[PDB]
Write a protein that binds this ligand. Structure first.
Ligand SMILES: C/C=C(\C)C(=O)O[C@H]1C(C)=C2[C@H]([C@@H]1OC(=O)CCCCCCC)[C@@](C)(OC(C)=O)C[C@H](O)[C@@]1(O)[C@H]2OC(=O)[C@@]1(C)O
Ligand SMILES: [K+]
Ligand SMILES: [Mg+2]
Length: 994
């Protein structure tokens, strides 16, 4: 292994002590293989059912539930073969919930897709190498490839490992690094070394990366690194090293069951001391075996009451339609839990070109020299029409229609655009729209020359298909192009060498046509061309040139500027070496500046308003772009990220600046910054780390495999629809339209869904709380069971679930996007609210136990010990003459349980309404605001009746229908809830804070 880009061909071959002619000997293989291991990415995490299903049963809330099942199961063996056939139903029900959720968990994981695994798709199975064994090439498993090995690659092949290119057999070698950056555009490679040791991947021109495809050509290369050491391998290591916190909610629930454990144990403690007087009891032992079962059956009934069994379902269901809901809005959410974190986002960093802008290019303005006389200097500024790539536009000076042929500056400028251009234009018949063939920026040049054909070749009659390339073709005829000097970032410009084709025009010999970044290329220009004539460059002219460039790049226009020039007297073709990019800058010198072209990558119509939403929403939006700081800042002010006159000095940074900054100042810039220009690959991961240092819930956009480590780091990684498969798998959500606004829209739902979800959760928790109290009162007083576990399940699973699900449909607040992002820390229930559900819970507690008691006594249908100690009901059979002048089996009766159950159900439908809003009275906030809630409420009651009246059910449940009169008692007991809450709902939004 090594940093082969900086090394020479000979150095690399020397390092490994390998011959380019023969390759590695079999011995060197043995040693190399042992030392460097195999050229493969590590294995998938070993998971098994037996390991999967146990994680299902390792949450506390599932363990105590499991434990409860056994007890009931055991208790149910003690049940007389006659006393109940259905004894075994109670334990089963618990288990089949635990089995059902267990089932749910596993299916989700089987489907879940790892991001690391997506990298493997880039691993080729085969590769071709040269070794000592054979003169002829051998095709082997990429896995068996070792560093220092001689490798052969050709078109179509997927690069097996990171390779230093030794020699290129083909005339030209092109590679497709789209897997990396997302760009389909091929790139030329060279043998000559890269001087910089820290050069970023993009600048390693003498390098081949594992996973990439060869666009064109054939080459021979030495293997620098393999397996984990490759660029892709390093990226895997970053992703493997990265760890993801649990959704804030998730974190809350874990502490919930955590605390719930303590509370549960505490209840038993208290329950035990309340009945401590039992030590001052007869030692006859009579009924001792009996007391245990009762306490045990109380324990299980307690567990189910404490836990909200139905909750898991209710939540996932709500998230599922919310997900489908977002899908309609072009927002694809993978993994439901992320919906919450999606509402909490405080910072969102979005790539410019892909999302924030259309990536649809067109030339708006352009200028050429008009007159250079002494200090006096004048230029010709033009304006072009048409945002589409479609050659349907007009050139106008001072808004007045112009025939381009009139100016000789334009004729030369136009030839440059067409000749120094790789991309073309194609017309598609199916969609009926003009489409770019190659690069967006280049395509708009081919587009321009059409609108301004300086030869005015007639094409109005030409078919639309033939129209697309007409005016370009004519220019391609004029000059034969010998070769081209591709773009390199050092000089930031590209050139072409052209022999004048044909005898009629065969004059002035060969010429060079260069285009690139204004600053760079203008320094090389020693002359300026006015019309046909040419004049030596002077300060004053150069200034007037650069001035308009700044105005166009930094001004309201925010145009990307290209400087077009020609080398009138290029060097002799023979003196030129075309295999080294380093010599390119010296070829492009002594140039004659013809004119510049300004083009725009227009922001999306939806963006401006979407940015404002973030201001209103408290969300900080950070832009990532490729433009130079100057214009980048300009674009920010154009979409509202910055005020036109707002100071930005400390809020805008480039990769260079950021790197120069010390760690402290770096972290500091992150909280301030809203614009990063010319960013390096590592930064995205860094920025996220920093934003997370301030506990910011951050969103990141990525398209390629390099962005992956970042998307997996950021709280919410966002990938494009056009994005690579790997980018998608690492992200939390994918933008189908790639539109930025789609991001903002998702956050709105993220907040909206969470609010309703918050309500139905408290609603379910509250019912639990109340159920625990009843059970506890039942235990402390020694009362007979008001509620049986089986019943509770039904209530928590179904009766509570439906209104809870309906609550998920609550109409959204109007100020959702006017409030700052929710604090992940903030608890669901605290302070006053906690006290509320504390009180309410108590009410339902007393209500249920009391309703069952009111039947045992003071009831016509039931024989009552009015205000007597029915409590000692354990001792009836043995102690019946004393106080028990009646049958003792009466305590088994269902009527009291149904009475107690019924009141619960009714109270719960009420409490559901009180949950329509946290602090808003129902007259202020009717129940009819949400139709579904009322609709679901009716449903739950119907079902409640069902279990009472249909033959098989009431028996199983231990319920019997109650007289109309008995029903009324329920109402007198349950309905008062709304009043209670309304009052606690009248203290807050008035006398408390708020
Ligand atoms: C039945 C449910 C049981 C036990 C149970 O939920 O127990 C407590 C508990 C985990 C919480 C408390 C409960 O306190 C009691 O109900 C005290 C009961 C005393 C009983 C007396 C027996 C002697 C909640 C529910 O209570 C109320 C309404 O505010 C509020 C809120 O959700 C939580 O504070 C929650 O823990 C958290 O992390 C929060 C932020 O979600
Ligand atoms: K994550
Ligand atoms: Mg990128």
């Amino acid at each position: 292994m090594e940093a082969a880009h900086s090394k020479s061909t000979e150095e690399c071959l020397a390092y490994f002590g390998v011959s380019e002619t023969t390759g590695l000997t079999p011995d060197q293989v043995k040693r190399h293989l042992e030392k460097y291991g195999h050229n493969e990415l590590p294995a998938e995490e070993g998971k098994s059912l037996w390991e999967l299903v146990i994680e299902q049963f390792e949450d506390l809330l599932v363990r105590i539930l499991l434990l409860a099942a056994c007890i009931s199961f055991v208790l149910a063996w003690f049940e007389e073969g006659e006393e109940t056939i259905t004894a075994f139903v109670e334990p089963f029900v618990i288990l089949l919930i635990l089995i059902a959720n267990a089932i749910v968990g596993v299916w989700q994981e089987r489907n879940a897709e790892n991001a690391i695994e997506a990298l493997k798709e880039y691993e080729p199975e085969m590769g071709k190498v040269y070794r000592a064994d054979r003169k002829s090439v051998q095709r082997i498993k990429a896995r068996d490839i070792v560093p220092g090995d001689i490798v052969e690659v050709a078109v179509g092949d997927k690069v097996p490992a990171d390779i230093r290119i030794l020699s290129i057999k083909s005339t030209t070698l092109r590679v497709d690094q789209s897997i990396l950056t997302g760009e389909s555009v091929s790139v030329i490679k060279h043998t000559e070394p890269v001087p910089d040791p820290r050069a970023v991947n993009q600048d390693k021109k003498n390098m081949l990366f594992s996973g990439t495809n060869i666009a064109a050509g054939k080459a021979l290369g030495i293997v620098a690194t393999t397996g984990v050491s490759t660029e892709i391998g390093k990226i895997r290591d970053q992703m493997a090293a990265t760890e993801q916190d649990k959704t804030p909610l998730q974190q809350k629930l874990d502490e919930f069951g955590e605390q719930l454990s303590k509370v549960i144990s505490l209840i038993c403690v208290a329950v035990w001391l309340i009945n401590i007087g039992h030590f001052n009891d007869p030692v006859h032992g009579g009924s001792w075996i009996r007391g245990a079962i009762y306490y045990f059956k109380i324990a299980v009934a307690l567990a189910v009451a404490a836990i909200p069994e139905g909750l898991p379902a209710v939540i996932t269901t709500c998230l599922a339609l919310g997900t489908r809901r977002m899908a309609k809005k072009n927002a694809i959410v993978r993994s439901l839990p992320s919906v919450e974190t999606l509402g909490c986002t405080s910072v969102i960093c979005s790539d410019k070109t892909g999302t924030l802008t259309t990536n649809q290019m067109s030339v708006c303005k352009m200028f050429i020299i008009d007159k250079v006389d002494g200090d006096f200097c004048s230029l010709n500024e033009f304006s072009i029409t048409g945002s589409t790539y479609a050659p349907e536009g007009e050139v106008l000076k001072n808004d007045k229609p112009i025939r381009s042929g009139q100016f000789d500056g334009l004729v030369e400028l136009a030839t440059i655009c067409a000749l120094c251009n790789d991309s073309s234009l194609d017309f598609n018949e199916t969609k009926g729209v003009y489409e770019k063939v190659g690069e967006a920026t280049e395509t708009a040049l081919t587009t321009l020359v059409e609108k301004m054909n300086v030869f005015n070749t007639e094409v109005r009659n030409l078919s639309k298909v033939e129209r697309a390339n007409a005016c370009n073709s004519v220019i391609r005829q004029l000059m034969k192009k010998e070769f081209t000097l591709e773009f390199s970032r050092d000089r930031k410009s590209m050139s072409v060498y052209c022999s004048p084709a044909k005898s009629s025009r065969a004059a002035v010999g060969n010429k060079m046509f260069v285009k690139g970044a204004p600053e760079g290329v203008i320094d090389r220009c020693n002359y300026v061309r006015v019309g046909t004539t040419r004049v030596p460059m002077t300060g004053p002219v150069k200034e007037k040139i650069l001035s308009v460039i700044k105005e166009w790049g930094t001004g309201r226009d925010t145009l990307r500027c290209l400087a077009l020039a020609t080398r009138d007297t290029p060097p002799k073709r023979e003196e030129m070496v075309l295999d080294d990019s380093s010599r390119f800058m010296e070829y492009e010198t002594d140039l004659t500046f013809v004119g510049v072209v300004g083009m725009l990558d227009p922001p999306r119509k939806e963006v401006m308003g979407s940015i404002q939403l973030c201001r209103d929403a408290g969300i900080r939006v950070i832009m990532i772009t490729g433009d130079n700081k100057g214009t980048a800042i300009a674009i920010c002010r154009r979409i509202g990220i910055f005020g036109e006159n707002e100071e930005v000095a400390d809020r805008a940074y480039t990769g260079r600046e950021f790197d120069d900054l010390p760690l402290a100042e770096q972290r500091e810039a992150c909280r301030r910054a809203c614009c990063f220009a010319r960013v390096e690959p590592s930064h995205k991961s860094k920025i996220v780390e920093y934003l997370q240092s301030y506990d910011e819930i951050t969103a990141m956009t990525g398209d390629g495999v390099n962005d992956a480590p970042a998307l997996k780091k950021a709280e919410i990684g966002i990938a494009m629809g056009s994005g690579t498969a790997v980018a998608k798998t690492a992200s939390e959500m994918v933008l189908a339209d790639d539109n930025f606004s789609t991001i903002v829209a998702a956050v709105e739902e993220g907040r909206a869904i969470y609010n309703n979800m918050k309500q139905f959760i408290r609603y379910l928790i509250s019912s639990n709380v109340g159920e625990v109290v009843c059970i506890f009162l039942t235990a402390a007083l020694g009362l007979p069971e008001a509620l049986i576990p089986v019943q509770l399940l039904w209530v928590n699973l179904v009766t509570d679930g439906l209104p809870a699900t309906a609550l998920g449909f609550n109409p959204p607040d109007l100020d959702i996007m006017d409030r700052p992002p929710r604090s992940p820390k903030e608890p669901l229930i605290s302070g006053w609210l906690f006290f509320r559900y504390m009180a309410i819970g108590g009410y339902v507690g007393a209500a249920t136990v009391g309703a069952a008691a009111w039947w045992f006594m003071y009831a016509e249908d039931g024989p009552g010990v009015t205000y007597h100690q029915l409590t000692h009901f354990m001792q009836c059979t043995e102690d019946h003459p004393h106080f028990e002048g009646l049958d003792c089996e009466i305590f088994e009766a269902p009527e009291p349980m149904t009475m107690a159950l019924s009141v619960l159900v009714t109270i719960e439908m009420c409490n559901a309404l009180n949950s329509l809003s946290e602090n808003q009275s129902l007259m202020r906030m009717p129940p009819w605001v949400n139709i579904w809630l009322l609709g679901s409420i009716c449903l739950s009651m119907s079902l409640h009746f069902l279990i009472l009246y249909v033959d098989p059910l009431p028996m199983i449940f231990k319920l019997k229908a109650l007289d109309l009169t008995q029903w009324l008692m329920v109402l007198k007991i349950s309905l008062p809830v709304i009043g209670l809450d309304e009052i606690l709902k009248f203290i807050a939004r008035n006398y408390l804070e708020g």
